[model samples]
Target chain A: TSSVAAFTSGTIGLSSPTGNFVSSSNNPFNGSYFLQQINTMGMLTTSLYVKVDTTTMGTRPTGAVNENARYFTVWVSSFLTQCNPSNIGQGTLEPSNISMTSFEPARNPISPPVFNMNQNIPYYASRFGVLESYRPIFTGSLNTGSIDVRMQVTPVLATNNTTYNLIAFTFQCASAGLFNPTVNGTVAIGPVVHTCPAARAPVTV
Target chain B: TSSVAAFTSGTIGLSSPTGNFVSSSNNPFNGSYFLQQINTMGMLTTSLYVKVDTTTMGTRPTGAVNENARYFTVWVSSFLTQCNPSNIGQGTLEPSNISMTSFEPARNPISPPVFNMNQNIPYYASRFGVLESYRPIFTGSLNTGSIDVRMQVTPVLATNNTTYNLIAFTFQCASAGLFNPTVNGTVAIGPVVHTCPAARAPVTV
Candidate 1:
C-alpha cells in the first residue's frame, strides 16, 4: 500500500485528482463483508476478493462496448495482524514473493504491485461483447494460486486514471473455481518456528 | 440477499476453537473488498477486493477443524448518489440493474468493524473465525451452466430479539463444491435492469 506512491505519483496520477492512491471508506453493499484466518508455513492464505461479471441482468452487456480488453486495479496491503513487527517472527513470508495476472489485463505482479496500469493489463471481456471471456492471472505460472488457500477481493472504481472506491470484500475462492487461478511457481517463505499456546486433549471422565 | 439466514444460532459457541474453517486473515486464500454501488433497480457493481489467510497460522493448533461453512456479517447502507431519481424511459439503455451476490472480505470497508462477538453468533478472531470451507450454496450450478451469478454473504447478527444487521455479497462458485447448508435457502429479488446511456451504435465514434 505505501509502495503505491511509486506508481501513483509519476505517471498514473497524471489524470487523477490527488494523482496518488487513497484508501476508501464505507464498504459498498450490506452483504459485502468477508474475512478469514490463514495458517501455514507462510502463516497466510488468500482468496479472490475482486471479481467482475461481464454478465448481469440475465446476460452480459459487454457487447455494448467495443473495447477488446477490460482493465482493473487492486491495492494490496497486509493486515496489521500479520505484518506488525510482533507478528513478523510468528510468520515467514514476503509480499513480493507473490504475483498477479488476469485474463485481459495481461499483467502480473509476480511480486507486489508498485502501482501502475502497466501491471493492470487487459483481459478480454469480449471481442464484440458477445464472447464474454476472462482468464484469471493466478492461473499463470508463477502467480497466486486459487487452489492454494483463501484470500479476498475488493473491487475498485478505476476509470480514466481516476480510481474511485466501490464495493470491496475479503473472501475465498470457491473450491470449484480453483482452476480459474493458481500459483504455478513456488516462492519459499524463508522459515519460522512455532511458539503459540499449548494443546489440550479431552480428559476421560 | 436479504432473504437468507445462514443458520439458526447453533447450540453454543465453540470456545473450543477448531481449526477447520478458514484460518489466518485468509486461508483457503482469496481476496475481498466492500460493495460500492447498489441501485434501486437492483444492479450492484463491486470493486476488486482481497481475502486474507487468517487460517494460515492454523485455525486451531491441534488440527484443522472440519468446518463445513462460514458466515459474513457486513454493516452496509446506501448514499444519495443522484437525488432526482431519474426514471428510466422506454427507449433508453443503462448499466445492468443491480442485484447483489458475490463475496470478498478484503477490499477494505469505510469503517473497520467493532465486532460484538457476544450479541452475534460465536465468531471470534482468537476463537471461531468467519471463513467457511464449503462456501458455495450453488457451486455445481455455476460451472455446468446451472449457476453463474455472484453472491454476497451478509452476517445477520441478532443484536436484539427481532432485528439483525443484514450483510451483502456476490458469489462466483469457485470449486463447484457448493452444497445446500443444513439450513439455507434463496430469495428472489426484483425484475431489475441495467440500462445504457444510449443504444449501441453499429460503430462507436
Candidate 2:
C-alpha cells in the first residue's frame, strides 16, 4: 500500500542518487542525468558551489577563526550498466577519471597559507570516492565564502560505444565537526549523439 | 561488507527521519530530538523558514511575479514508540495536533490580498500529512522572500504518560512546476524532562 511501514520494514528500496523509492529492480540508477551525450563527446564538464557557515545554528562564537578552516571532498558515481546490461552496477570513478579544472581564492590562510588542492587523505571507503580535498578559501568573511570548484569527467571506456550516466555528484565533509553546509550547482551533460558508418561505408559511391 | 548493494537491495532499510540506514528494528525513530520536556510542559514550539528562488537555475525571467507564488506543505511525523514500545510505529500528526502560532507578512499581494495561511488542499497521502499551506508573502523581490512559519505541537496522547520524538519535519512543494528550492531552518525541541509522584501526596502529609 506504499505505507511508511513498507519503507521501514525493508520491503522497498530508496534510490541513493535521487532519494526516491525504487519500485522495480535493485541498483536502479536514478541519476540527475542520463549522459547519452557522453557516449559521443567522451567528456563532460560540471561545477558545484558549497558554503559552510557556523552562524546557521547560531551566531559564530568567539575563537572561531581557526575553526573555520575545514576540509571537504567531492564524490562522483557513474552507472554504465545501461550501455551493457552485463555491467549492471554503479562504478566509482577513480581520481584519474576526473580533472579539477578550476577553483577560486587560490589558497587558504592557514599557518603558512595552504593551497586549496591539498589531498590530505589518500582514499576513502567504497561507493564514497574521495575525489578532491581542499581547505576553505575565504572570500570576505572567514566562514561565509562559497567555494567554487569546476571539474571535468572522462568516463572509463568512453570510446567503447559505452553510454554512461553521472549518477551522483556530492560534496561532503572531510574533516570532523561540519554538518549540513549549503550546496547549489549544476552539471551540464551534452546535446549531441554520434553514429558511425558500417565497414564498407565507401560502397555508397 | 556494507556495500551500497545492501541499501538498494533492501537488505537494510533507510530511516526516513534522518536519511540513515536502519540496521536493527523497523520504524526506528532517528529524530533530531526527543521531547522529554514536552511530557512535563503540555506543549512545544518550533519554527522553519524556506526560500524559493527562480534565480538559482538562472536569472529570473521577466513576467515571473505571478509564477513566484508557490504553494508549500509542512509534514510532521512523530514516533511515540520509544515511550511505549508496544505502540511501535510512526504516526503522522493531524492538522488538529498542531497550531500555527505566528508568522511574518500579514497578507500576500494577490487580487484579494490573500492571507498567508490559506489551506487550499485539505489532506495529502498517508505518510505526508499536509500540516499547512501558504502563498509566498513577498519581502523584497517577488521570488526571494523566506517564508517564516512558527508552530505548536501538542501530542495526541501527551497526558498518557507517553514519550514522543519529533521524528521528521519537512517542507515540500504543494503545487507543481517547482524543483530544488533552497531550504534551511531548525526545529528546536525541549531541554527539560518530566517525572511524577506515584501515589497521593496526602499520605506524605
Candidate 3:
C-alpha cells in the first residue's frame, strides 16, 4: 500500500581479533528485509546507510607499520521475485544488474603508518564467484567510517508487481594482532521499498 | 628539495556526443606529474583528487527516462620509476599494487527519472584487459560531482630511493542523445609526492 518504506536493524556487534566474526543471534548482524513496488516508470530505487564505529578500537600505530589496525569485511545474499504469490521460484536476480548510485567519502583518507587495505565494492563482488557461497559487498578499514550506499534496478514488470529481498549482510572485523576490541552497536539501514503503479493496458481505439 | 608537492591542471573539458574523449593537447586533458621521496620507514604514498563539475549541462528530466543525459568515463596511464638516475626504467609499477586509501562520496546518491550510470573504480580497472590499450580508473555520471581519490603504494626499498608518475588520465564524456553540452573547466589534482630514506647497510667491523 505504501510507495516507499525504509527498514533499519538493531546494533550488530563485531568483535574478533584473530578469527572472522560471523553473524549469529548472539552477535546478530543480519538484515533480511523486503523491497516492494514498481513505479510508473518501470524502475525501483533504494538506498542503504551503514554506520560503522571504530572509535572504541585503539588508534592506528604511526608509520608504515600496521599494528592494532582494525578493519571489517561485508558479505551479502540478495534476490528478486515477482510480487505474484506463485512466481517466487521463477523470479530472477542478477547481482550485476543492481547499480550503485553513490559511494560516500569517495576516497579514503591517508593515515600514514597504517596501510589502507580498503577496496571498492565492485572489487569485492568480483571475488564472490570464486568464493562460491556469499557475495562480497564491502571490505575496508573502519576508522570511524560509516557507509552510505544507493542502488537502482529496472526489472521487467510485464503484468504483476515485484518484490526483492536482500537476505542479509554480515560484517566481520579483525585486528592486526591479538588486540580484540569489539566494534559494538553499529546500526544499518536495509531493504528500501519503492512502489510503481502496474503497467497500463494498451490504448485501444 | 620540497618534502610535499601538489600538481594541478587547467580545465580539461570533455565534449563528445558519442565517441570516447581521449586526452590530447588540442582537446588537452592530461596530467603527467612526479612523486618523490622515501620516508624513514621505507614507504611511498600519494593522493589524486579530480574535480568533476557537470553544472554546465542540462538538468536531468524526471522519470526512468534517459535523454540528453551526460556521463563521463576515465582511463589512466601510470607507472613508477626509481629516483636513481640509472634506475629510471628498471623500477616496477604494478596497477594492482596501488592501494586506493579513500574514495569520496563513497556511495552515489539516487535521482529518480535519471538512471545512475556510475560505477566504482575497481569495477572499471578489472575490465582493462579485454580492451587492452588502457587501464580504466573511473566511469560515472557527472551531475555536478567531483571525484576525490587517494592511493598508496609501498615498494621494497633496499638501498635506493624511489619516484613515481601517474603519467596521465583521459576523461571521455558522452550523451544518450545528440545534445552534447561540453563539461569544461573541470580541474584535477595529480601526482602527490612522498619521500623515504634509504635502508642502512649492516654495520660491521
Candidate 4:
C-alpha cells in the first residue's frame, strides 16, 4: 500500500460563473496510479490505496454572529474551492469538496482539512483511457469489498471578518498492482478568484 | 415494463434522527416485484427502474422575497419534514425536498406528482418464498448492472401560513420481471415531524 497527494487552489466571488445566486466549478486537483504484482512461491500479492489530503480556507469576514455570515468566510476559503459553490446553499457541492476542510489560515494557522489520507485503494475495470470512466468500486453497504476511506469536507470554522487571497486542496493515492495515469501529477486550474455578488445598497424608504 | 407509482408523506423540523446538517434516510417508500416469461422462445430478459417520483412541499409561507424566508415555507413542508429544518440554511436538506414541483388540488387540481405510471416489465432473481426477491442487481460504476433512477424532492410551494399537517413524496418503478420487496409497493416512512429550535417565540414571529 503506497500513497501520494495532489494539491491545487483558487478563489471565488459573490456572483458565480453560472450567474445564479449560488455558483460551482470543478477542482484542479489530480493524481496518478500504477499497478504491480508479486508472485513468489506459487502465490500472488497486491493492495490498493486512495484518499484526499487538505482543503484550506483563506480567512473569515469579521463580526459574523450568524450562520450564513460565517459561511461567507468558508465560501471564500473555497469550501466550494474546487470550482463548486454556486449552489453551496444546496447539496450539489458534494463531488468536489467532499474531501475539503475549513481553516482560517490567516488566523488559525492550521495547514488545512485532510481525510482518507492513506488507505487501501479500490478496484477498477480496465478501460482504454478516460478520467470519468475511472471509478472507485464499491460493494454491499458494509461488505468492505475494496476501498475503505472516509471522503468529505468538514464545515467551516471562522472567527472574524477577513479577506483571503489564496485557497487550495490536495488528493492522494498509491497502491501495489494499481495503474491509473493521473498519478503524481501537479496541475493548475484557476487564476484564484474572489467571489461575491455586488448587490448592496440601503433600502428604498 | 408494468410501471406503478408509490406515494407517502411526512414532516420535518429543525433536527432529525442523525442530527447532522445534511442527512439522508432510506425513504419510507418501498415496493415489490414480479417476473415471468411470455413465449416459448425461452429467452432471458430483465430490467429495474427505481427513482424518487416527487417530493412536494405542502405550501410556502406567503410574501417571501428572497431565499431563506421562502425556504422557511419549504422547511415547514418537512424539508426533512420530520427533523431536517434547523440546518436547511446550510445545505443538508436532501431526502426531503429540492427545487421540486407540486400542484394544489384546490388551485391546480393535482393531488401529487407521479411518473412511470405505464411501462413494460423486467426480470427478477427468485431467491425468496415470495415474488419480491429478484431485482436489478447493482455492481460497481460502469459494471452495467441493474436499477437506475433519480431520487429527490422538489421545492416548497405555499399560499398562506397554513400548517400542512401532511407532506408527501412518491416513488415508482416498473419492469416485466423484477423483485426486491420494495419493487411495486406504496410504503410509508413517517407521519412527519417539524424541526426547529425553541428560541422561536411568539409562535408567529
lDDT of 3: 0.22
Candidate 3, residues B1-205: lDDT per residue as tens digits? Answer: 1221111122222221111222211121222222221111222222222333234333333332333332332322122122111111212212223222110011112211211112212111111111111111222332322222212122222223332222122222222321223323333222222222222211111
Better of 2 and 3 by TM-score: 3
Q: What is the lDDT of residue A53 in candidate 1?
A: 19
- DockQ of every candidate structure: 0.01, 0.01, 0.02, 0.02
Tell me each candidate's TM-score.
0.22, 0.20, 0.23, 0.19
Per-residue lDDT of candidate 2, residues B1-205 (tens digit): 1000000001011112322211011111122222111110222222222222233222222234423333222223223332222222332221223221110111112222111112322212112222332223222223322222222221222334442322222322333233212322222111111122111111100
lDDT of 4 by residue, A75-168 (tens): 2233343332221222122223322222111111111232111221111111110011113432222111122121111223222222332222
Writing each residue's lDDT as its tens digit, candidate 1 over B1-205 gives 1211011110111112111222221232212221122121222222211122232222322222322223222222221121101110121111222112211122223332433434533332221222222121111122211112223222232333332222232222233211222222221111111111111111111
Model 2 off-target regions past 4 Å?
Answer: A1-75, A78-135, A138-145, A148-205, B1-163, B172-205
Q: Which ranges in model 4 have alpha carbons more than 4 Å from their true place? A: A1-151, A155-205, B1-14, B17-149, B152-205
How much does candidate 3 score in TM-score?
A: 0.23
RMSD (Cα, Å) for all candidates, in order, is: 23.4, 23.5, 23.8, 23.6
| Candidate 3 lDDT by residue in tens digits, A155-188 | 2222233322221222323323212233233333
The better-scoring model by DockQ among 2 and 4 is 4
Q: In model 1, where do residues sit more than 4 Å from their true spots?
A: A1-205, B1-35, B38-44, B54-157, B170-205
- Model 1: CAPRI class: incorrect
Chain B TM-score against the true chain B, each candidate: 0.26, 0.23, 0.25, 0.18
Q: What is the C-alpha local distance difference test score of each model?
A: 0.20, 0.22, 0.22, 0.19
